[PDB]
Amino acid sequence: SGPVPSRARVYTDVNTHRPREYWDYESHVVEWGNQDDYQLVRKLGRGKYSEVFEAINITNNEKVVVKILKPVKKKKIKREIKILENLRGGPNIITLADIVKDPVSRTPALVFEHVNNTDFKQLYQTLTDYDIRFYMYEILKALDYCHSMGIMHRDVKPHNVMIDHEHRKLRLIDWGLAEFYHPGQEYNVRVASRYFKGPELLVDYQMYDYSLDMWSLGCMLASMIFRKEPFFHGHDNYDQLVRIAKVLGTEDLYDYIDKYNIELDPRFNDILGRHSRKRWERFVHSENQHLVSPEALDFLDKLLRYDHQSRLTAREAMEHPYFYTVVKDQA
Ligand SMILES: O=C(O)Cc1c[nH]c2cc(Cl)ccc12
Ligand SMILES: O=C(O)Cc1c[nH]c2cc(Cl)ccc12
């Protein structure tokens, strides 16, 4: 009979009330700078979607980050460029300084502000319980801003949180998968990294919204406070839902399926089984108790929900008791 429709419950119509140029990135006109403004210094890593380099702007001798874009539809490039341009100056959003194209190889490249190459996956065992709360809050700042701007990130994971610990600086990067949210649009589900893929993606429910970023945040939170990385470690996209179900239980999984009238892959028919919902206490142990509290546990539970609509929004998360002393200290 077809899936049941769904609307985001915050920032639902933000993009409708913008000029078309705001979200119609397909017609955006890129103005290209000169790639001879920059000399590449060293490779910073990454693959698949790009190759990232540290680079010097010869004009001001200031360090810069250059993402050579790997061949993909021109519109996906315009999309990322326009989302970046739209989010420029947002709290903890990476800042685009320029766009250039190889003189010969016509390959486009994005030039970014520099931040000290340390992302969130490393920096791990050095994080205290207050550090987790402070960096989680900083990520929520960036998530709530882009959401309020009609944009969902869709690849939230530790490799995409850059941090300068010495200055408590954090930047949400990689906007290459980000989309504008439009009420009633059916989105591609092959986004995100497996361990951070929301259930909606795994059961092919396409009318999803910002709350997908909140699931992915929940996955990060869990692996940190429990010191199990990743927390849902599935061997593929299908087994990734089974891992989730072994923890959230199958009762709620199937109520979600029913509520939105989702037709499940006949596959899953044989692998999901019956699984109670576990109490978070079962993942607590002596090496991570110092990171677990009633506050963290309450907050985590409120992010990891099958039903994308019962997950906390960014702004609700930011008001959770979990963040009280970071909210206090920051003022
Ligand atoms: O070494 C290269 O690939 C050529 C090249 C020199 N400087 C650049 C700056 C950008 Cl942004 C992109 C490509 C280049
Ligand atoms: O923006 C992106 O998607 C590319 C990227 C990968 N690693 C980085 C580190 C910094 Cl500091 C700035 C930007 C990047």
* Domains with residue ranges and CATH for the chain: 23-112 (3.30.200.20), 129-329 (1.10.510.10)
Query: Do residues 248 and 215 lie in contact, with contact meaning Cβ atoms separated by under 8 Å?
Result: no
Query: Do residues 199 and 215 lie in contact, with contact meaning Cβ atoms separated by under 8 Å?
Result: yes
- Nearest ligand to the C-alpha atom of residue 56: 1
Q: How many Å apart are CA 49 and CA 67, to the nearest integer?
A: 9
Cα separation values, 274 from 66, 196, 222, 250, 287, Å: 48, 23, 23, 6, 30
Q: How many Å apart are CA 293 and CA 129, to the nearest integer?
A: 9
Ligand 1 pocket list (CB less than 6 A): 35, 38-40, 55, 66, 68, 100, 102, 109, 111
**Ligand 1 atom nearest to CA at 40:** 7
Omega cis (within 30) before 230: yes
Query: Do residues 201 and 208 lie in contact, with contact meaning Cβ atoms separated by under 8 Å?
Result: yes
Q: How many Å apart are CA 294 and CA 310, to the nearest integer?
A: 20
Query: Do residues 66 and 40 lie in contact, with contact meaning Cβ atoms separated by under 8 Å?
Result: yes
155 catalytic per annotation: yes
Cα separation values, 4 from 18, 196, 206, 207, Å: 27, 24, 10, 9
DSSP 105: T
Q: How many Å apart are CA 180 and CA 200, to the nearest integer?
A: 18
Cβ(257) – ligand 2 distance below 6 Å: no
Q: What CA dihedral angle connects 92, 178, 49 and 88, to 10 degrees?
A: -40
Cβ(173) – ligand 2 distance below 6 Å: yes
Q: What is the resolution of this structure in A?
A: 2.3
CB atoms within 10 A of CB 276: 11
Chain-centroid distance of CA 327 in Å reads 22
Query: Do residues 141 and 87 lie in contact, with contact meaning Cβ atoms separated by under 8 Å?
Result: no
Please tell me the residue having the least CA distance from ligand 1 atom 6: 39
Cα separation values, 24 from 19, 68, 147, 171, 275, Å: 9, 24, 17, 26, 44
Q: How many Å apart are CA 85 and CA 68, to the nearest integer?
A: 17
Those residues whose C-beta lies under 8 Å from the C-beta of residue 282, and which sit 6 or more positions away, are none
DSSP structure string for 47-99: -TTEEEEEEEETTTTEEEEEEEEPS--HHHHHHHHHHHHHHTT-TTB--EEEE
Alpha helices, H only, 93-176:
129-148
Query: Which DSSP helix (H) or strand (E) runs through 38?
Result: strand 38-45
| Strands 96-101, 33-34: pairing kind | parallel
Determine phi and psi for 282, rounding to 5 degrees: -70, -20
Smallest CA-to-CA distance from 291 within 59, 135, 82, 90 is with: 135
Cβ(241) – ligand 2 distance below 6 Å: no
Query: Do residues 295 and 136 lie in contact, with contact meaning Cβ atoms separated by under 8 Å?
Result: no
Cα separation values, 215 from 109, 114, 221, 247, Å: 31, 28, 10, 14
Query: How far is the centre of ligand 2, averaged over its atoms, from the C-alpha of 165 (Å)?
Result: 17
Please tell me the residue having the least CA distance from ligand 1 atom 7: 39
Q: How many Å apart are CA 249 and CA 272, to the nearest integer?
A: 10
Determine phi and psi for 263, rounding to 5 degrees: -90, 120
Q: How many Å apart are CA 290 and CA 324, to the nearest integer?
A: 18
Determine phi and psi for 279, rounding to 5 degrees: -80, 140
Query: Do residues 67 and 60 lie in contact, with contact meaning Cβ atoms separated by under 8 Å?
Result: no
What type of residue is 119? D
Please tell me the residue having the least CA distance from ligand 2 atom 9: 117
Q: How many Å apart are CA 314 and CA 326, to the nearest integer?
A: 16
Cβ(46) – ligand 2 distance below 6 Å: yes
Cβ(145) – ligand 2 distance below 6 Å: no
- Report the residue numbers after which the chain has a gap, meaning the C atom sits over 2.5 angstroms from the next written residue's N, or none: none
Q: Is 249 annotated as a binding residue?
A: no
What approach was used to elucidate this structure?
A: X-ray
Site to substitute for ligand 2 among 48, 51, 161, 162, most atoms within 8 A of C-beta: 162
